[PDB]
């Protein structure tokens, strides 16, 4: 009701009573909404070498 974490700079800005201290809605249940994902399906794998330049072996 005083501060909410927002504003794209990671800052405690000012919000309302129903905006900051009630981030949940007043809906009864999770309705038949379009589904969500946050997962890139690229299946990218990065392998690092991290070798030593000395020891002559």
């Amino acid at each position: 009701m005083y501060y909410k974490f927002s504003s794209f700079t990671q800052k405690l800005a000012g919000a309302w009573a129903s905006e900051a201290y009630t981030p949940q809605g007043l809906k009864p249940v999770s309705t038949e909404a379009p589904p969500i994902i946050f997962a890139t399906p690229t299946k990218l794998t990065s392998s690092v070498t991290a070798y030593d330049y000395s020891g002559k072996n």
């Binding site: 009701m1 909410k4 504003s7 800005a13 000012g14 919000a15 309302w16 009573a17 129903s18 905006e19």
Partner: protein, 78 residues
């Protein structure tokens, strides 16, 4: 305890309206933007009533009747 924004706890930015003429350094939380609002259709110019003689009969006395025709214009009976 004057300055009723400090007196009313949750309803502080509802009873008061904040407008910015010059944008500050801090961007505000809950920026918000209008969607595409629907436009009303265009109609003709209403007939004015400037004399008492043309005002006679313009006060309703019986309940409303709405008539919709196929090739007949839609009429309203007062």
């Amino acid at each position: 305890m004057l300055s009723v924004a400090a007196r009313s706890g949750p309803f502080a930015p509802v009873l008061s309206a904040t407008s910015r003429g010059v944008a500050g350094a801090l961007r505000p939380l809950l920026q918000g933007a209008v969607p595409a609002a629907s436009e009303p259709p265009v109609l003709d110019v209403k007939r004015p009533f400037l004399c008492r003689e043309s005002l006679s009969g313009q006060a309703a006395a019986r309940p409303l009747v709405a008539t919709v025709g196929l090739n007949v214009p839609a009429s309203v009976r007062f």
